[PDB]
């Protein structure tokens, strides 16, 4: 079972206006589509310098999000393929849920079992038999020979996990991941969009790899099936999602959660810009900004803080930073036994 999570690198700034207008006329009244496309073609100004935005779209337009979503749908048709899309969406009279199939047969017919797009981050989940994986690997290696086994060098891995939890870079599995990525990249034209390997993660669960690693919505998640390498299905660890099958109603898999490194970096940057923009600012404003950031992080990433000890350290460090800033604001000298009241 091989996952590919990536993103369209420049889908915002590499949307042609004529193509967008033609594709919008397909779904909305041509006057509205022409208006929107012409609205995306306006003069961008800043200080003494301005230019004419003629190639890219402007993300600041109120309707722009819709455009992007529609454009993303087109990208899906390029990646999924219309038939497979109709296999996942279902009949037009009876559409399926987000992740559900009309029957097991159409689920197992095609390698692409799950697929979500979000705004620009595409997550695809393939299942592969041995022969299909071998054929894909052979087809990839036919045009990209690698006698020196160099495919393991440029392989992004989730370093935030221990060695056993991390992806095991077996030669067959590395080759399969590269082949899957190349197959997906082939479907998308190089001009309408682009998918770059280094800004992507391909994680394969096989005999060698016992853990499936993926990342979405700022969550670094790892799935460990209970069948192979789960000596204890413990419950005390609150960063664990006891995944349960809908048929056997058993604990088939264990889901370990973690806060993504990008989210931690964003939170640290937010706290840093809160603190550094406090030369002339009331203490209550600073505390309110810190409180808002903290509730946002903790409510969004609940159950994912507990496993991210680095996040706990960063949180307490930033809280101490806020307290130190307030204390310096009070008096220009550090208190020795300051109280928390």
């Amino acid at each position: 079972n091989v996952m590919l999570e990536s993103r369209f690198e420049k889908m915002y700034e590499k949307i042609d206006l004529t193509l967008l207008n033609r594709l919008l006329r397909l779904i909305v009244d041509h006057n509205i589509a022409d208006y929107m496309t012409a609205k995306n073609n306006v003069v961008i100004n800043y200080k003494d310098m301005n230019h004419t935005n003629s190639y890219g779209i402007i993300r600041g337009l109120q309707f722009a999000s819709f455009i992007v979503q529609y454009y993303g749908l087109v990208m899906d048709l390029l990646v999924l393929g219309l038939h497979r899309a109709s296999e996942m969406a279902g009949p037009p009279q009876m559409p399926n849920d987000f992740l559900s199939f009309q029957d097991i047969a159409t689920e197992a017919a095609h390698p692409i079992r799950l697929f979500c797009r979000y705004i620009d981050r595409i997550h695809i989940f393939f299942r592969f038999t041995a022969d299909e994986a071998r054929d894909l690997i052979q087809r990839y290696l036919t045009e990209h020979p690698d006698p020196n086994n160099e495919n393991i060098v440029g392989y992004n891995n989730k370093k935030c996990w221990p060695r056993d939890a991390r992806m095991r870079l077996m030669k067959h599995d590395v080759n399969l991941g590269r082949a899957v990525f190349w197959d997906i990249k082939n479907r998308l034209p190089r001009s309408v969009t682009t998918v770059q390997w280094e800004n992507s993660f391909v994680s394969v669960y096989s005999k060698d790899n016992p853990n499936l690693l993926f990342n979405m919505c700022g969550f670094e998640c790892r799935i460990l099936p209970k069948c192979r390498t789960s000596y204890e299905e413990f419950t005390h660890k609150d960063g664990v999602w006891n995944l349960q099958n809908e048929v056997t109603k058993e604990r088939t898999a264990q889901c370990f959660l973690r806060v993504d490194d990008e989210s931690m970096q964003r939170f640290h940057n937010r706290v840093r810009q809160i603190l550094m923009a406090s030369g002339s600012t009331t203490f209550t404003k600073i505390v309110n900004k810190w409180n808002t950031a903290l509730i946002g992080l903790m409510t969004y990433f609940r159950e994912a803080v507990v496993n991210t000890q680095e996040l706990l350290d960063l949180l307490v460090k930033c809280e101490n930073k806020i307290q130190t800033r307030i204390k310096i604001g009070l008096n220009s000298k550090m208190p020795s036994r300051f109280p928390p009241v």
């Binding site: 005390h236 609150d238 609940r302 159950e303 507990v306 000890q309 706990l312 350290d313 307490v316 460090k317 809280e319 101490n320 307290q323 208190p335 036994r337 300051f338 109280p339 928390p340």
Partner: peptide, 22 residues
Amino acid sequence: PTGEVLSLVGKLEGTRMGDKAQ
């Protein structure tokens, strides 16, 4: 009693998250 915030890594693992909330 120092007034500094201590990191709760390796701490209070005897408590869940749904506790102390109705």
